[PDB]
């Protein structure tokens, strides 16, 4: 995918962001967007094609893959990145608006907006982490047993690349936890 | 797909747009174009290939897929984005024309044009929402029963990734509703 | 495909073009090039692979697909865009030549050249429309009956995605008609 | 493929080229590079995969495809473009060298070099045209009869998309003839 | 994958880096990123598809490929590049922070930070080398014998392109050793 | 692959290079990088997929393809380009270092470094030529007879596109010889 527009706006907000905030944005670019592009998308590329079920029943593989993976992991991470970035977009928009007003003519209302955006980032990060956990836990097993119609009885289905997917799941979970910790540091640093 | 040209023109119109309008354009880029590029196109990539029908009849799968999906969802969203953006293109063109005339030498006629473009955006958004609804509702079921010739009788066909497609359908519907609400806010803000 | 070079030259000619001409060029970029890139190429991507014929005869599918689609639609639209743009290239080249001569040192000969280029655009547009019509009409049917050797007798062949292709055929026909109408407006506006 | 570097150098030589030369370069970009990228590469994409031979003999299809198409057409056109452009590269290099020498400090030796480069362009164009003609004529037939080992006897093989390939073959031949005529015009214009 | 953002930041740090450091960064770009993009990704492209196991057992190939290659080599090299680059990112961030503070208003604390970043680079490089060694040694054999359920007994599986993969494994190992040696040179040069 | 970074550095070294050196670099870009991108990569794209062996033995095709092509040709050419370019990178780095030192404050040591880099280029070119020759000669035959386990006895395997690959092998060999001759000219010109 093409993240150029998002990257441009995030670069814009870097100028008006705290040091911790700049660390957060660079982490976002290097350890989330770049990982999905260079590494994860290739891992998940053959998710359905190499999904195999031990049956002669038409449509069983499709329904079972859908049940096993309601939403693909890479897609969920895309959404997580976008929603997490959106508060920064709101903040930079507010700042640019203030600048344009000054042209017509981090304190106070602007500072409060910054803190609010940090809070929203934290909430979205926790929400996506919890959602991933309930969806998949954090370990993808090779065997999925499926009892969804049209499959006759329970059928054994086998996932592609489960170990590598587990590795990247855990990597992204760690990155999200790091980003959350950075946000906590931002709040503490503002407090100081 | 390459949206660079459209992005450039939309960026141009940002300068001469209202704050709500800038919010609308950023929503368009981040939550529509970027979603289609990064996420949705991969979801719908194997729509026909992994479409499977329980038959030994040649051509049944092709005719049934065509009947089930007259137009693909991602294509309809492309068209929706383009038509929705077109009013902004008209408005920016009018503004640039006025500027060039001033060189030769948001009020009045220009303001009325802006409001008209907002109205067109609202109409196109509602039209595409209603069209999608009548075409597909908002839930893609896994089973499609097909009675189209050459299929003998009704045949059971099975869709790929129905749950994920439902998730993205609903996501895009929400984004469109948000954009419509933003347009309403634009009109109210102008009224104030 | 990469249209960057053509886009650059067309952007150059925008500066020295009429308001109607700018509308025409933006229509060309947004509703032809962008449609082919984002939407149509994916539609026509699996034209031959998912073309299926009810036979056990080697080579029948290849010969029948070739007979049914002598030239693919997307390719014909590429050619249409290029030939339609070429008059603008001639006009901008003439203008730049005049500028360089002035450096060494829309009226008259330049205006006549502009009108001639409009006429060529109209002729090429009508020609491509008529050619498409005679080749395919404007509705792609799912069933193609083929009697081309090596096929034994008439064989039934089934086209992929006929409905979506019909939708895009009609969309592009509408866009071409709109562009032609714009050219007529250009001539009338010059007359005024 | 990526032609950015070649495009940059050709754009550089446009400044120091004749009006006819600029027409030639724009023809090269729009009607050769852009055609190969947007249209022809997709046509020839499935040349070997959809090549089918009526046999049960392993390796017959590979050897027969190789014999039928020793070099693919698109590849030959790539080479033609590169060799044809190379004289312009030589000329621009000579001009830039002269400029750098003047910094240290179209007539005469430079003009003769320009004419020589035109001559080389004409020779390379004629050579590639004749080579294509002897290789393939100008019509690709659907049926190729192959007697190459390991094929037992003569086997019937069937080419993919022969009509479309014929259309593009003829289109590129016309473009090459146009470019040659332009070179002739360059020489005559210099003579005047 | 797209490394533009990382490349931009690394280019930024080149200005404030030692001569040995610049050599290290150019080695990183030319002999790691460019190798993975141009060469290695194509080698490893068909890792699972052309993985073949001598069995009629569903799911055996998937489980055996996963066991043989828990993480793909190219993915591990991506991670290695990112982690190795991260210290440079920290250093450049610290330097830019100091610059911004000076605006508000290689020695001392900055120099110590530089040395620390060198140490982290060395540790990460050694860690990835050792991890690769324990995972795969440095020779990929063609035969993998697999006893993982559902495979019945030990099954013989055959890897794709083992020799080429061995060649690139050794090439990247050499590059990593060279980079480590460069870091040692950096420390010695600072000592001098 | 993406050669932008290498291209940028090579463009930088053009400014501080001899006329023959500029000819060499343009040859490198136009006749090596552009050929691999536009033409050769498509030729070698289906090397393993269309490799066919006359056997019913699992894994025989993989082992035989690996034995026949230990390293793919396109990969070897990538490595050749990178190693050949590396001396220019060393030279430009040395020159930029001298410039930065002058800021703090082709003759002599710099000239000797330039000659040394030419020598390294010549050695690497000869080495890669000889290596290719011993690996493959310069003609790819269609038939490869393979006796590698698990294949039972000698099996006949058939290569894809052998003639086209031979053509490009010879083309690249010619380009390398031309570059070597250019280096010889560089040394002679310096001698004069
Ligand atoms: C924009 C955000 C988009 C989020 C999209 C979430 C779509 C989830 C649809 C689930 C559909 C479903 O059929 O799921 C069934 C499941 C109960 O069946 P199970 O027990 O067998 O599932 C065990 C796991 N297995 C099914 C794989 C075996 O129900 C569940 O897990 C429900 C889990 C729901 C997690 C939602 C996370 C939202 C994050 C919000 C962040 C923003 C704030
Ligand atoms: C700053 C750079 C940090 C780099 C850290 C690299 C860590 C590499 C760990 C490799 C572990 C291999 C374990 C294994 O050989 O697998 C066999 C099994 O193992 C099992 O059954 C369960 C194993 C579960 C392991 C979960 C590890 C989580 C690591 C989180 C680290 C967070 C750091 C911020
Ligand atoms: C530029 C815009 C391009 C819009 C292109 C719309 C193409 C629609 C062609 C439909 C062809 C057709 O064969 O459809 C048959 C259908 C009656 O058969 P059914 O009851 O089984 O359909 C139930 C759904 N199923 C068929 C999937 C089972 O008829 C229908 O739904 C008609 C629905 C028509 C919706 C049109 C939305 C236009 C939005 C305009 C926005 C600009 C203002
Ligand atoms: C600002 C950020 C907002 C993020 C919102 C994330 C929402 C995630 C919802 C996840 C629901 C999982 C339900 C499920 O586990 O599936 C099981 C079944 O469920 C069914 O049968 C029918 C379920 C139908 C659910 C439709 C949800 C529409 C949500 C629209 C929200 C609009 C916000 C602007
Ligand atoms: C540069 C422009 C490139 C244009 C390339 C045109 C190639 C057309 C080749 C046709 C080869 C052929 O075998 O076609 C046979 C056809 C008579 O057989 P049919 O009655 O069964 O065709 C019914 C349709 N079906 C065959 C699909 C069933 O003949 C025909 O239709 C002849 C139709 C010819 C239309 C030409 C349009 C030119 C536009 C020029 C614009 C610039 C000014
Ligand atoms: C400014 C924005 C304009 C947007 C216009 C959107 C129009 C959407 C039309 C959807 C029609 C669905 C008809 C249908 O449900 O299909 C069932 C059947 O239908 C048939 O059998 C034959 C149906 C043939 C319909 C041909 C429609 C041509 C429309 C040209 C409009 C030109 C505007 C410039
Ligand atoms: C750099 C330029 C690269 C050019 C590469 C040319 C490679 C040609 C290799 C041909 C190998 C061969 O096996 O070909 C056999 C052929 C005699 O067999 P045939 O009668 O059955 O061929 C009838 C056609 N069929 C075979 C398809 C049925 O011999 C022939 O056609 C020889 C034709 C040779 C044409 C060469 C054109 C060079 C253009 C130079 C431009 C620069 C100045
Ligand atoms: C400035 C723009 C010019 C656009 C020209 C468009 C020309 C379109 C021609 C379409 C012809 C269709 C013939 C056909 O329906 O096919 C049936 C058969 O036909 C046969 O058997 C043999 C047919 C062989 C036709 C060869 C045509 C060569 C045209 C060269 C024009 C050069 C112009 C510079
Ligand atoms: C961020 C860094 C991400 C690193 C990810 C590492 C994932 C490794 C998961 C291994 C899972 C496993 O199941 O592995 C089993 C293996 C014991 O089975 P085996 O004896 O048959 O393995 C022989 C090799 N065969 C299995 C192919 C035949 O255990 C092992 O090799 C454990 C080897 C663990 C190497 C970890 C290297 C970490 C580098 C850290 C750099 C940063 C500081
Ligand atoms: C500055 C540029 C340096 C370029 C160096 C190019 C080296 C090319 C070596 C080619 C060796 C072919 C050996 C062979 O024909 O294979 C047959 C077997 O061979 C075997 O069984 C085991 C063979 C294991 C060979 C391992 C070679 C490691 C080379 C590391 C060099 C590090 C330099 C920094
Ligand atoms: C960085 C540079 C990377 C270079 C990588 C070279 C990898 C070569 C590995 C060869 C592995 C092997 O198994 O090869 C076996 C071969 C003896 O078996 P054969 O007689 O059947 O081979 C006849 C040819 N056939 C096997 C296809 C039928 O041995 C040979 O050819 C050995 C040939 C070795 C050529 C090395 C060229 C190095 C260029 C260095 C340039 C920098 C200075
Ligand atoms: C400046 C531009 C130069 C363009 C040169 C284009 C040359 C095209 C040659 C085409 C030859 C076709 C031969 C053929 O029809 O194949 C049939 C067989 O042929 C055989 O059995 C063995 C044939 C082996 C031919 C090897 C040719 C090497 C040419 C090197 C030229 C180096 C120039 C710098």
Swiss-Prot record, chains A, B, C, D, E, F:
Hey, what tissues is this thing expressed in? Detected in eye lens (at protein level). Eye lens.
**Topological domains annotated Extracellular:** 42-70, 139-166
Q: Where does the protein end up?
A: Cell membrane; Cell junction, Gap junction
- Highest taxon of the source? Eukaryota
Intramembrane segments lie at 1-11
From the record, give the cysteines joined by S-S bonds.
53-157, 60-151, 64-146
- Residues crossing the lipid bilayer are 21-41, 71-91, 118-138, 167-187
Record topological domains on the Cytoplasmic side: 12-20
The record's function comment reads: Structural component of eye lens gap junctions. Gap junctions are dodecameric channels that connect the cytoplasm of adjoining cells. They are formed by the docking of two hexameric hemichannels, one from each cell membrane. Small molecules and ions diffuse from one cell to a neighboring cell via the central pore.
Subunit info here reads: A hemichannel or connexon is composed of a hexamer of connexins. A functional gap junction is formed by the apposition of two hemichannels. Forms heteromeric channels with GJA3.
Belongs to which family? Answer: Belongs to the connexin family. Alpha-type (group II) subfamily.
Protein name per UniProt: Gap junction alpha-8 protein
């Amino acid at each position: 995918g093409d993240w150029s527009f998002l990257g441009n706006i995030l670069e814009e907000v870097n100028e008006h962001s705290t040091v911790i905030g700049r660390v957060w944005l660079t982490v976002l670019f290097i350890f989330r967007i770049l990982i999905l592009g260079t590494a994860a998308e290739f891992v998940w590329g053959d998710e359905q094609s190499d999904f195999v079920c031990n049956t002669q029943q038409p449509g069983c593989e499709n329904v079972c893959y859908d049940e096993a993976f309601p939403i693909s992991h890479i897609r969920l991470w895309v959404l997580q990145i976008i929603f997490v970035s959106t508060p920064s977009l709101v903040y930079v928009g507010h700042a640019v608006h203030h600048v344009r007003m000054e042209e017509k003519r981090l304190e106070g209302t602007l500072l409060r907006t910054y803190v609010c955006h940090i809070i929203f980032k934290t909430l979205f990060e926790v929400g996506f982490i919890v959602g991933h956990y309930f969806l998949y836990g954090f370990r993808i097993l090779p065997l999925y047993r499926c009892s969804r119609w049209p499959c006759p009885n329970v059928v054994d289905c086998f996932v592609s690349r489960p170990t590598e997917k587990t590795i990247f799941i855990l990597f992204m979970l760690s990155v999200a936890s790091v980003s959350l910790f950075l946000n906590i540091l931002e709040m503490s640093h503002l407090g100081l």
